[PDB]
Design a protein around this ligand. Sequence first.
Ligand SMILES: Cc1cn([C@H]2C[C@H](O)[C@@H](COP(=O)(O)OP(=O)(O)O[C@H]3O[C@H](C)[C@@H](O)[C@H](N)[C@H]3O)O2)c(=O)[nH]c1=O
Ligand SMILES: Cc1cn([C@H]2C[C@H](O)[C@@H](COP(=O)(O)OP(=O)(O)O[C@H]3O[C@H](C)[C@@H](O)[C@H](N)[C@H]3O)O2)c(=O)[nH]c1=O
Ligand SMILES: Cc1cn([C@H]2C[C@H](O)[C@@H](COP(=O)(O)OP(=O)(O)O[C@H]3O[C@H](C)[C@@H](O)[C@H](N)[C@H]3O)O2)c(=O)[nH]c1=O
Ligand SMILES: Nc1nc(=O)c2c([nH]1)NC[C@@H](CNc1ccc(C(=O)N[C@@H](CCC(=O)O)C(=O)O)cc1)N2C=O
Ligand SMILES: Cc1cn([C@H]2C[C@H](O)[C@@H](COP(=O)(O)OP(=O)(O)O)O2)c(=O)[nH]c1=O
Ligand SMILES: [K+]
Ligand code: NA
Ligand code: NA
Ligand code: NA
Ligand code: NA
Lengths: 397, 398
Amino acid sequence: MKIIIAGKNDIAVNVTRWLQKKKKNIEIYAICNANDTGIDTFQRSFKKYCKDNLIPIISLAEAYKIDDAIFLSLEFDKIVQPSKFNHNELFNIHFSYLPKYKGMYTSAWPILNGEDTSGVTLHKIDHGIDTGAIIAQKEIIIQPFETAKDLYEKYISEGTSLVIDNISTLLNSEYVEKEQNIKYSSYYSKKTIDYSNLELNFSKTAFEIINQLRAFTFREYQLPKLDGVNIFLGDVLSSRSIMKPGSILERNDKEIIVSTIDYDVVLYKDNFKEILEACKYSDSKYIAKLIRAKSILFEKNIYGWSPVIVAAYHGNIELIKWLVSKGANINDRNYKGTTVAMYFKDYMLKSGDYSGLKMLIDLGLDLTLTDYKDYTVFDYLEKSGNKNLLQYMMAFM
Amino acid sequence: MKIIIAGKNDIAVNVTRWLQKKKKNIEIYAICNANDTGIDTFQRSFKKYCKDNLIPIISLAEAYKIDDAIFLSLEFDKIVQPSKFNHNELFNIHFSYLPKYKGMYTSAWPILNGEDTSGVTLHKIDHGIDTGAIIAQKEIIIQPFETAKDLYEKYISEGTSLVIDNISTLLNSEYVEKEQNIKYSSYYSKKTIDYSNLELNFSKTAFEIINQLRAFTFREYQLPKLDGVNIFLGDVLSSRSIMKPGSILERNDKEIIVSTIDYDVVLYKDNFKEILEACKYSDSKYIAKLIRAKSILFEKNIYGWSPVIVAAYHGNIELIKWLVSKGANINDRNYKGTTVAMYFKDYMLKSGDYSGLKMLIDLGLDLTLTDYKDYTVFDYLEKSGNKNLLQYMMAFMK
Ligand SMILES: Cc1cn([C@H]2C[C@H](O)[C@@H](COP(=O)(O)OP(=O)(O)O[C@H]3O[C@H](C)[C@@H](O)[C@H](N)[C@H]3O)O2)c(=O)[nH]c1=O
Ligand SMILES: Cc1cn([C@H]2C[C@H](O)[C@@H](COP(=O)(O)OP(=O)(O)O[C@H]3O[C@H](C)[C@@H](O)[C@H](N)[C@H]3O)O2)c(=O)[nH]c1=O
Ligand SMILES: Cc1cn([C@H]2C[C@H](O)[C@@H](COP(=O)(O)OP(=O)(O)O[C@H]3O[C@H](C)[C@@H](O)[C@H](N)[C@H]3O)O2)c(=O)[nH]c1=O
Ligand SMILES: Nc1nc(=O)c2c([nH]1)NC[C@@H](CNc1ccc(C(=O)N[C@@H](CCC(=O)O)C(=O)O)cc1)N2C=O
Ligand SMILES: Cc1cn([C@H]2C[C@H](O)[C@@H](COP(=O)(O)OP(=O)(O)O)O2)c(=O)[nH]c1=O
Ligand SMILES: [K+]
Ligand code: NA
Ligand code: NA
Ligand code: NA
Ligand code: NA
């Protein structure tokens, strides 16, 4: 009944928070990665979560001496001496389908290499990097429209789940170790991609080039650029410019068209900011005309505001309905964990118009959700003494 | 009526040969690569071949102007601008299973990526590099141990066959085309590997690093190095050393063991030349000791002498038998087409010891083969006046 969670970001926090609610008797210790500066971004800080839940934050030296613990690495950044532990209960979540794509930038390389699938892998920590034996594995399908950001989010959801599904095997040490194949194993270092001098390579096929776009589309770090201008995805055209690859063929307000090894490509200029503004008040027929790629309906600005969030804070229900039919999350959250329902609560208070709630509820809105300060929409309504809207909302429970 | 054959190496030569025997009627024009100096090497010079067979050599500019000729490009080094022709009977043999591995280094990249198979592809020349419609294809097994060179040699062989299997349908407009899929498409430029500063990268899996050695093992151009020391393959150990990958563990004279991302690997130093000299006169026993990577027994130096060839010239019969049991080719040739049976005949002349011939015939030695001058071993003995050894060798041929 002891566990050491060593790692970072949302998966570290999700697994930890699951444990606290569902196995309240377990003692939890944490180790944080070097560059966890204790501040939330588009990723939760695990250091911050741990300080706020009174989870003692230990070091690796101390971890070696805590004999009855299991040691769970959720993207931990430091090599560990597996034999130094007095037990063998040492696990790691790796964001790939091992033995492929060991190492770095696993939301990028599978896409770059034109993979259809990737995965998450729960394995033993061994003397190899990402090389210890497999315990549990999840194949993830990458969709042709999906970016690095989209795939990373799958890694988060699916890795969290993978841990939770297997948590008892781990806790009881009743799991089977199957050793990794050497065959088709791959590894990429941090040197494989220079994200500080990121340049698209057009001396490639059009298939490859779109796959670069997809792969490098991870807004919160960067977007790919063509001539100082951000791009959000692209498509293959039927034309084949004789121009040397890289040559810009046309240039207009919506796009750039380039010569590749084979088929020409359209790079769509990023209009995410325009779209998000429009979402305050535009109908879906107008918004649909603005979209050149589906994935952009689910992007977020620096606060974590998505199209569905903006639309909810402005009571733009007709648009919310459409967005959800395009696959948006009716319970989308910002980087404080603030839910769509919380944004709409604000619209309901500001407008006095409460009737739309049932519409959102029927779209899957969940009022029981808690933000990162652990407050529900009902809590906020009490703090602030808006008893009428509170009673109205309560009636749905 | 007419056919333009554009390219280099054994593929250009063998396809051109084939057309000359099996299609004398057809006029042949030839275009050559910039790096074909007219000197044979590990591949033949198409230019030398064309000069010696009085095949006219033309330029690509001149070929653009030749209507009612088929155009076939075989490891050609120039962009063919297809609309510059006034017809559309434009064909290329590419050394990949298209649309994978378009462009360059098709002997290295697939191995580097850990592929089981590659291919040769016969297609139309269209707009784009290796993009035109597929006519015929052959899948090719890459064996786990084979080098880039071995892979290249299969490309040359299988490419030649695919052209030969389909060349009539090209001449007679009876072929079919399927457009290439976009999906799974790849291209590698000349920049994708810098042979000049070829460096090994141990920041990789063992599998990847052995695949690195394989892909960089093309001796006539280079072998991989390590601290400047040439390397002939390696194996995957079971040790998982904690030293940051690239860290050289043990040096001896046979090998250097290295730290990887996962398992350590033994690189084997290139002693090939040492093996070649020892093959003159030493026995199975001494060579088996010299040998780490078995397939080093099938390497050739820049004239095409392998272990069996050197062994045959010095009548090292027991060494020959052992080498064949390892998988050497009993009729192995150098780069002038000179066969084992030719090297042996020189031993037979010097030693007067003819007795080992029967043993060789029974391993498959073939006395009917010709070199590139088109002489059998018989023709050489008859020219030099050795009627005796001539008739002896004839008595034993099958
Ligand atoms: C989506 C959106 C939000 N806002 C305002 C409303 C919000 O109070 C402020 C900061 O946004 P936030 O940081 O996303 O809000 P936070 O996560 O602090 O949540 C707070 O504000 C929301 C509206 C409340 O339901 C919640 N209970 C508060 O904690 O920006 C706008 O002005 N326009 C918008 O489109
Ligand atoms: C230049 C070079 C090549 N190689 C290997 C890798 C390569 O696949 C093989 C043959 O080399 P090449 O003849 O220079 O041409 P390559 O394989 O790059 O083929 C390309 O160029 C020719 C001219 C095209 O018609 C062909 N379709 C292309 O694939 O030898 C080396 O190992 N070291 C080298 O320095
Ligand atoms: C294999 C070998 C050959 N030699 C000699 C003998 C040979 O004539 C000369 C050049 O080698 P080569 O270029 O491989 O031979 P080439 O293709 O010129 O064929 C000639 O010499 C051989 C031995 C004759 O059977 C043949 N009939 C000749 O055309 O080098 C050696 O000195 N040491 C060797 O280990
Ligand atoms: N023994 C062990 N094996 C593991 O698989 C593992 C641990 N420890 N500890 C936690 C986590 C740590 N994983 C890693 C993985 C890569 C690097 C690393 O330094 N990579 C660099 C340099 C590679 C090199 O030295 O060439 C890179 O650029 O990739 C460090 C820690 N982990 C499992 O997640
Ligand atoms: C660091 C970095 C990552 N990425 C992408 C590819 C990664 O698989 C994904 C997740 O990165 P993350 O796990 O946050 O960082 P790192 O791999 O450096 O520890 O983010 C970028 O697009 N740009 C960047 O600068
Ligand atoms: K501490
Ligand atoms: Na990097
Ligand atoms: Na082009
Ligand atoms: Na190069
Ligand atoms: Na190592």
